[PDB]
Amino acid sequence: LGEDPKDPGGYFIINGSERVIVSIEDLAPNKTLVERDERQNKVVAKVFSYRHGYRALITVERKKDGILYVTIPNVPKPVKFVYVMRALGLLTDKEIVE
Amino acid sequence: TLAQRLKGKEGRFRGNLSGKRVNFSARTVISPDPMISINEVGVPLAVAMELTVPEKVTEFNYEKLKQRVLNGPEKYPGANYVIDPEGRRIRLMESNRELIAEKLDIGWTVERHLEDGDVVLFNRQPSLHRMSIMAHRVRVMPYRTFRLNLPVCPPYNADFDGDEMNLHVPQTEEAQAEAKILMEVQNHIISPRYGGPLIAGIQDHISGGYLLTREGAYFTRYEVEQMLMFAGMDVNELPEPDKYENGEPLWSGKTIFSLLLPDDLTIWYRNKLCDEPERCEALEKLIEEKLIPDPEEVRKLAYDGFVYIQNGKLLSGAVDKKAYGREDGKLLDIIVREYGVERARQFLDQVTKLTIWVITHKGFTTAIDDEDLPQEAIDRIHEIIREAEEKVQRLIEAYKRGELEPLPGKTLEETLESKIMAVLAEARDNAGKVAERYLGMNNHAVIMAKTGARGKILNITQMAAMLGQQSIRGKRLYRGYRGRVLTHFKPGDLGARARGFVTNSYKSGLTPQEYFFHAMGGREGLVDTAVRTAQSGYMQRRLINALQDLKVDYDGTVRDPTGIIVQFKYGEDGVDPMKSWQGKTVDVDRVIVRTLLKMRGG
Amino acid sequence: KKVIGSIEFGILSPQEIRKMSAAEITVPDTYDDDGYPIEGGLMDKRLGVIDPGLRCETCGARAGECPGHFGHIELARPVIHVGFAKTIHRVLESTCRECGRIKLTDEEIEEYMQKFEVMGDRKGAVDKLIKEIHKKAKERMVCPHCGAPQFPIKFERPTIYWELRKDEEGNEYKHRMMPSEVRDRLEKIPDKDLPLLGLHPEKSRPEWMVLTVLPVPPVTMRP
Amino acid sequence: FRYTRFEKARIIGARALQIAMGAPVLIDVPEGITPLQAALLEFEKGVIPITVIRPS
Amino acid sequence: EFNIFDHVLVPEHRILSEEEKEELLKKYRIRISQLPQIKASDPAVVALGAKPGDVIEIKRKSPTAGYYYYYRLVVE
Amino acid sequence: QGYLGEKYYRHLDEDGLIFPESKVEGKDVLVGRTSPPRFIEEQSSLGSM
Amino acid sequence: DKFASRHGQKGVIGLIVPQEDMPWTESGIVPDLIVNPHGIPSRMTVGQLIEAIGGKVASLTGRRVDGTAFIGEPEEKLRKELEELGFKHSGREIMYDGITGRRLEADIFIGVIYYQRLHHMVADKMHARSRGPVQVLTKQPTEGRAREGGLRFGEMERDVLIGHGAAMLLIERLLEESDKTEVWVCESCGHLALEDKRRGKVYCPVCGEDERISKVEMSYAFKLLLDELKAMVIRPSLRLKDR
Amino acid sequence: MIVPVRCFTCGKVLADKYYEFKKRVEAGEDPGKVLDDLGVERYCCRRTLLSHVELIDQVMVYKVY
Amino acid sequence: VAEKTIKSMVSKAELPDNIKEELYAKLIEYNEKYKLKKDEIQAIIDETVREYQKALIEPGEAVGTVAAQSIGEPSTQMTLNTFHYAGVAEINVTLGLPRIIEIVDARKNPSTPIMTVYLDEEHRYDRDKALEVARRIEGTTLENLAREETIDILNMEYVVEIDPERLEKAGLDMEKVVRKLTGSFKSAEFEAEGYTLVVRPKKVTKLSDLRKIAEKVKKHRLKGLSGVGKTIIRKEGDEYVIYTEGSNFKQVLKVPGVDPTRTRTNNIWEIAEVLGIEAARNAIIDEIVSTMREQGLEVDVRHIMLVADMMTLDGVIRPIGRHGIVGEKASVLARAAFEITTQHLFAAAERGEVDPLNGVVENVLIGQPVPVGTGIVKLAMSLPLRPK
Amino acid sequence: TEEHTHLELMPAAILGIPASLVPYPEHNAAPRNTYGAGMAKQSLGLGWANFRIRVDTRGHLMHYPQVPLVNSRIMKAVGFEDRPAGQNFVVAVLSYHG
Amino acid sequence: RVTSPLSRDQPHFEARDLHGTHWGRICPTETPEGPNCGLVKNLALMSQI
Ligand SMILES: [Mg+2]
Ligand SMILES: [Zn+2]
Ligand SMILES: [Zn+2]
Ligand SMILES: [Zn+2]
Ligand SMILES: [Zn+2]
């Protein structure tokens, strides 16, 4: 067929110029991370999450007054935790406990 | 749009207005030759016929340029474009030149190829300091590389592993005499950053010059006569007087070196090879009290580490990197401040070819046995590495049972790491002293290290001994798994062998934890080359563009563009830093001794 | 064979844009299409040559040695220039409306005439002097010549302007400022107030900052 | 009254441009020489006509 | 008890006289505004008799000339 | 119009292809291509008709 | 033509010396690549020197020496197989120079090193440009050899000529090899004039003068710098001066 | 890429003594004695018999002008 | 031959030579005693005047360009050094290339201040009296006199822990434990092992807000003067130096025992407010000199004294880029090609502004010879011009 | 001993595919290997048998390639000793005329 | 090859190092020089995905 057997293969021939995908290294989807301490504020915990496309940072930070920020993707404006955590699915303070 | 057309790191102040693309240039690779003078350059013969100067025939080159236009643009003395006084250029290529080689009508302007003598420039492109553009003096040789004399390669900061240098001819007759008078190589032999010489000797020129002035360098009659013809100089039949006829009528090594110096030098200084300061002292003591002794009797108590020249005759010494060199050499230094400049371009042109002759026909190989230590010296090393690891294992036990002995500044975790590295350092320095003491100064691997030409005394004892510890920006190696760097070590361990410390040479083989520890320390060196270069480039643009306005007026005053006086009597008046000596001024001390000697000696 | 001595900057008057320009462009069309690139508008309506056709504004002028020429657009609505907008805001909140004064006492008129010639050399020292004039004119609401005619509070961030005016007793409605309302106010400032700011009465009129006529760049700058 | 290095490189530059545009040469002849090198030889014998102005 | 002087960093200042202003001005052919302007703050000038609009001479030392003068002005 | 030159076409055959093993050098052509008019009526710059 | 080892000793062919002038050895050996001795105990490349003996042992014995990492052929077994095949234990041999011919009083090291040629060859680097095709918009040269263009002279190269003192050369390089244009400019308006051929007479639009008008000689990139400031509402009043 | 008909340092022909060499090394005989049995004396002749590829078989079969 | 003969031969000759030169030349001639007599004395002075006359700067030089290149070349070869220095006192003072940027750009903050403290003539040799000076300089709060916090049950709310040796090895004076009541709020009094148990026995004003007292007296304790960082003592030149941390000048100089006249500092903006501008001239000069010598490679101090005497040009020190000397007074076109911001800056001088000439970036922009270098000389020549 | 949990295979395969071309790579320095493993990716050499019937934009071919002498045992079992790249010179170490 | 998505120019001193998990998966030596110098890295010769 006009080849040599030592060629390993693994490359497309789109348009007549042999093109290869080079593997991009992710940062472990659907995990959770415990970020380090004492660069400007207290400890934070950043994460990534994507399904069918769009990926976004969803962090739960806290600085030295007990704000406990939560980050939203769209329209950033960092929101307090007990604003979001009450408004999401739980109303009773006993339910936040459990 | 307009704001992106005006600006944007390549807009129309820096990209196209104050920096433009040019004409009449070339760019190729470089390759050495130490046979041309210090201020010449090779030009390939293809590039020489595609760059042209304008010539404007007056009255006394009219016989020359009749021949340059009769010859066509093929044979190397030739022309390309002739110009009438109207302005209509006439290309020469097509089918006849005899009808253009008629009455040539004084006033025309002919463009001919470069010849031996036309001033060019040169460039390296990263253009850091003031001196990386320097007008050379074209010489034409057939191949495809720019050639370049070996001593002129610390200004350009180049080497010869396929780099790229670009020349560009200047054309108009006012812009050409500025290049020849103000920018030639010999005006730039000393540097304005520290005064010391910059264009000087390199790798072979130093370690060849040590083999000429060793005690025991006796050349025969044929070897003297051959090398004086090869190093340029022209002397008649006076190599005299055949100093040791015991075997055969053969000379010494000092008197072949004492033909290059002018006739009334007087210098005495101490250099790097001094291993016994007492036998220099004695020589010095006689000199200071009895200013002019006799060169025969007392002076044959000499050493090989005290240079002493009088009346252009080196009685006692040994030439190393204190007489040339990219850093301070005070024998090229005292020859540019006393005997013009044009003398010191032919001192450095005759030294260079004399020194490479003797290093060629005497051999300077370096095989594998030069790094070798005998058995009893190796067991001296291994008892050092054993007890130094045991001292580390004891100091961990003091921290583990609560016998902290703390330092005031650091915390207990940080005191432990502090103390350990000092022990490890000392261990590697103590074993470096063992090897240095043993192997003699007679192999061709310490000759390159004592004098100094691409060597240290670190990497010849980092090749038959330890390699020390292996750190990364001051910390000891800690990145890895949860409490263990590699997965071959029991966790919870702070021992020397288990946290980045190699113990084998580059001859006795690295085992795979030590080799993998060495790649960690090696990648830290390669990142900091490409990072640090980009920060210095932007930091230079601030300082040039803030300070490029300042001149020096005739009454000695540095002034801004608004007329506000910035500094009276330039630079704490008033001596040029290119010609001051080591911060100071007129140098009375050397002057007194020099003038007295000449007068008294006569 | 002269040389340039000095370059003096300023602002183009809209009167001078018409006299400099050779044509008005009214045809929103470039080529239409793939043949005969000639219009009565943006291409060579005696405006500039890029082709090998000798038709120019009566001056021959083939593409070698042809300076391009400027066109103009009679904009139907007044238009704020972008670069001045931070500094138009410095003018509007520091002037007494409907008359044209400066909201200062007679002491500072006679003092700051005299302070100009004392600091008449250095650039950095007179640049701080023009900020404090903006400071003192802000915190006043009573002018000596109009009896405090209900000064509104100006606004910015980024480009759209407003005012905080009261109508019945204390309302805080955000009346949007019109660009036609601004340029009518700027013409009422007399020329004597321009030395009190950093302006010049022959080279930089403030009412010329609002683009009533937009000039068109030449053909030789648009290949 | 010794010249500096900036004035010596301008006097040569102006004299090499006159020597190409006419301006008959002194005894400088032999056999072929570029007009810049004619200005160096005339400057060696100290017969330059051009003098400097010293602003003070 | 100490002052700003008697220190290895601060060179000593002194305020000139009326006849010395024109004598300094004709040697250097300058105008009075073309001099580098101490502010009326910064305690070196305040313990002397600082008047704005005056020339003040300093006597600083350099290790490569000896002693070296450097004239300045006073602006508020 | 747009002739590159002459005596650069000494290596082409009739149809426009270089017959192999010929010392092509410099700016010698490889395939002789004719293009079609390309807007006979766009400019009419006094001689293009 | 750049050669290199696989240890990292890159370099360029110095010259091309004939076979007759070669320092040769007390056998039929005439070396090819005479490497500089000042680079081995400065760059710490001891693997060069083990491989150079390992070529001489494995060429006389017959079998290609295994040389893999960490489990390969050891150091001491080579220098004994060389010592029993007829040569000195460290490579060193007696060598005669080819120009004059006498034993060099040292014992010159010699081996077999596998080099490899690289494609930074000189015929893909060398180019010269006298005067080529330029940009349409600026009349400046192009970029790349595939579009026939030269070098570019940044802001570094302007400052390395002011450090010398060159003011004549700095003009001649940057503008004479560029666009120069002659422009008619009015006097009392400061704005540019407008010529009009077929009817001679030149006139400044702004205030309509007839003869009081002059000529200013300036670059074209400065003339385009005026127009990008002229499109924006800035007026560049020129107030020219005699020489 | 057929064997070079000279050496590269020592001018001496070798291509006549390669196909006789290789047919006697695929019987198990040691090459240290085979190259000595022929006329190969130095080790500049011998580094270019003992390391070669003779890859002419693969390229030839493809058949294209 | 004697003193008078030389001194008055140098005094007469003096006028072309310099003042520094005079002292130097005399003190060596007199010193040398194998002595030369009369005629060679005149030969030495008439040779010394020729080298001074040879080594003056040529008028027209381009000082400002060769200052910026010879200070910006060694920053590319500005590699790492021995971060494992074998000292104790000086610790983590940001060695290297980021120091050179921090001294050129003004930057009010600068990281790692280390102020050198010298001792006077009565606290010079005394070992233990040097310790009590370090007591007075250091200063400690209550939060760093602990190691962690364990909560109590009801009202004690806090506890102090390991270790107590910060008051028995340095001597931070247990009499100050009694002193704690100074202007405080509640101030309970219970000292068993010398540490004060602080109860807060009240109500609705204080309910559970422990955190607001953590910024008051619990943190407001100042057990010693000059409320700044840590102190280390080194032996240098038979005097003890106290290389402390931080920078609190006008408080530190008013301490009984520090020699006030010699304490140099690693901060820039504070030495201008306290010691004056011309002291901050020498702060910039002496600091770049100490960085170059640590890396082996030398730069001449004519280039440093051109930058430092240009960065203090208007009585307050300026930065070098985009807010300082380039952004300060020049031609208005000179500010166009630097600080790519230009619609901020080029449209600012669109209003009422002229621009003459006489930069270096302008004459290159328009096609004129620049003023530096060879475009500074002016020729003149008459015209019979006979060949002869 | 009776303490371990696994056992390595051959450890001469830590490094990559163009870093297993350098013979004795445990004796050299570390930055010299990085240049050495960056030039096995650039040498000339006969790589494939189908260089004749192929249209690639620029190719190279070296007339007499040679299988190296002393090398790793990995490069026999990847194929490099069947399509090799480079020749075997015979060097000497001495300083010639400059 | 195994590349890593970051910025090529700004320094990442903690993302251009050589970590203990790279043993036997990523080659310690192969890294092209330039501004990258440790953002493109090659798989080892004994690994599996
Ligand atoms: Mg290079
Ligand atoms: Zn026109
Ligand atoms: Zn009013
Ligand atoms: Zn007019
Ligand atoms: Zn051979």
Residue numbers in the entry:
A (entry chain B): 148 to 245
B (entry chain A): 303 to 904
C (entry chain A): 5 to 227
D (entry chain K): 2 to 57
E (entry chain H): 6 to 81
F (entry chain B): 783 to 831
G (entry chain B): 880 to 1122
H (entry chain N): 1 to 65
Give sentences copied directly from the paper behind this entry.
For promoter-specific transcription, RNAP and general transcription factors (GTFs) are recruited to the promoter DNA to form the pre−initiation complex (PIC). In this study, we determined the X-ray structure of TFEα and the cryo-EM structures of three forms of archaeal RNAP, including the apo-form, RNAP–TFEα binary complex, and RNAP–TFEα–DNA ternary complex. The structures reveal that direct binding of TFEα can shift the clamp conformation from a closed conformation to an open conformation. Our results support the universally conserved mechanisms of transcription initiation in all three domains of life by showing that direct binding of TFEα, a conserved GTF in archaeal-eukaryal RNAP systems, can open the clamp of the stalk-containing RNAPs.
To resolve accurate structural changes of Tko RNAP in solution through interactions with TFEα and promoter DNA, we determined the cryo-EM structure of Tko apo-RNAP. Three-dimensional classification of the apo-RNAP dataset showed that 82% particles formed complete apo-RNAP structures whereas 18% particles formed a stalkless RNAP structure. The class of apo-RNAP comprising 56%, which we refer to as a major class of apo-RNAP, was further refined and the resulting map showed a well-resolved core and structural periphery. We discovered that the cryo-EM structure of apo-RNAP adopts a closed clamp conformation. Another 3D class covering 22%, referred as a minor class, was also refined and the resulting structure was similar with the major class structure with 3.3° shift in clamp conformation to the open direction compared to the major class structure, indicating that there is a slight mobility in the clamp of apo-RNAP. In this model, the clamp of apo-RNAP is closed conformation with a slight mobility.
